[PDB]
Amino acid sequence: RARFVSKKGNCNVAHKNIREQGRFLQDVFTTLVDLKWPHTLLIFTMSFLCSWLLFAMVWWLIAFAHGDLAPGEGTNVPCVTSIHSFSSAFLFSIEVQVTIGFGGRMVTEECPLAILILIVQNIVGLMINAIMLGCIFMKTAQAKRRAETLIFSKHAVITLRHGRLCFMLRVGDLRKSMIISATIHMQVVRKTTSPEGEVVPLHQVDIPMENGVGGNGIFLVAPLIIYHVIDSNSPLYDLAPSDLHHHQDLEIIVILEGVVETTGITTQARTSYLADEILWGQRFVPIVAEEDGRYSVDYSKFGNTIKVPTPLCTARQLDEDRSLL
Template identity: 30%
Template sequence: MPTTMTNTTADQKASCPLMVKPQRRRLVSKDGRSQTRGNTRGGSRETCFSALRDLWGTWLALRWRWVVLAFCGSFLLHWLLFAVLWYLLARVNGDLDVLDHDSPPPGHVLCVKHVNGFTAAFSFALETQLTIGYGTMYPNADCPTAIALLALQMLLGLMLEAFITGAFVAKFSRPQKRCDGILFSPQAVVCEQKGQRCLMFRVCNLQPQPLVDVSVSAVLYEERDDHELHQTALEFSIDNLGSRSCPLFLSPLTFFHPLNPSTPFINNPSSQTHFELVVFLTATQESTGSGYHKRTSYLPDEIQYGYCFSKVTSVHQNKTPNMRYFDTVPCPLTLANTHTTDTPDKEHVVVQLNGEGSDRVE
């Protein structure tokens, strides 16, 4: 009986990764990486087949250390493969038995001159692939097999180089890899704003260039009593822009979502089922038009109730040796749908905008 209960619990954990509260398993990490994995009950063989069916996507999803290792390994294996083929060609043709390749026996046609061992065959395969020029070793035009093998190596080598080059360019140009300077606040807050209770988080842009057309979307993943993962879209806005995108991203932006009694944020999360709020941000670089994408997530214990973000002011950089964008201050919660006028504003954060600082930015 205990074994059956253990298996049942394990199956529930596998089907619903957010089910166990103490482990706090996430769907998305704080830096935006997906923490979910596909169903592995089919074994490693099915996982390998899935990776091979989507080879391009698998390659782009690899970390840089594995990409560099695959880059070096693929070329080494390519050279080694054709070194073996060139060596076998020389052995089958009898070139290895010729002592002096400059003066071969009458009637013997050498396929590759001076390939008299495996080391020479590997060197010839390397020179062929890198097109660094032949020295004493070169293929003989009177040996059709050597010409065919040479053409095959060049074709496969060009395909390999094209794939590797394209993969490197694609990894460098991925939108999520260009936005390390976009920071989400590590904590979200619930406070009262404009007469209603709101969920808020802040985003800061540390990129050297401004971003335009900034939009944010969010999905609430919630576990309910049926142990199913329910998804709910939440709309966040900035000031009076509503659902429209922010035209310019210079200073820190604070996004808010009005709460209602049906949302799990309205009360303390200890009395609610486990949930995770995943936030997606998209923006465009003004100079190049390239897209930026970044995401993060907030668990129940990463939401501060009765706090609000410190106000942000813009003054000269010399007056602010330490800039704190995500500081929070207490903001007591009153009854729902009541406006709190005593919003603490004693703590401020200073931010330099375009090298000057005289305008106040809320």
């Protein structure tokens, strides 16, 4: 069966039959940033190279119009000195736009059109420099790479905490640096049908994380076990261990939304769990222990679970057995 979100956070949904193209034409900057790294390197090279070539052709045409390309006669002030071919105009355009200025090839005061083209080339070069350097720095400072160092346990767990049959997870951070105002958004994706007859193919019903204040905020120095208490309001209220095989409609996705402390740009880390990746009657082992003078986190035991005696009844049947007693 298809997977809505990969375990590395990749979203497998394909967008097709998009009739509206002018939305992408109005949004050029987002198309430019979201390109792949070879494509952005190609555009970054080609924009500067095309600007140099275009103004080089303008300089070469100006030097042709003034007779500077003709070696006949002499003692005539050229528009730009030492322009003899297209290579001279290309080197001079590179010297102007990158503001190197060797000065063997230099604008003169004889031609006002040379001064106007110099002004236009400087303005266009400043604009291209600003846009391209900002695009490259925004691509390097993207917060998708920070979500790689955020890890999730490979197997979700269902056990009994305070007699409530909670659905537990484990998040973890591989970085010394913190994540500012970290929030956790857990959803259950299925193909739920309303009693009237409406079929939603990827119905996402969010499940509350037991924070303690009724919020989403977490503190992520150490790995945390994130547990959603399965109660009467939970979508997993009828979930059974007779379920949780590979050919089951259930999917549960966890989203860690935070702000990177070092860059200030918000990041999003995603990890989904299929039904066969949710273990019944198992519990995460403790991995944090007191070191020589501090706390040490054993990341080799990050996904490790143990068998724990847990009832095989659903939360409905467990609640009914509790009410009968």
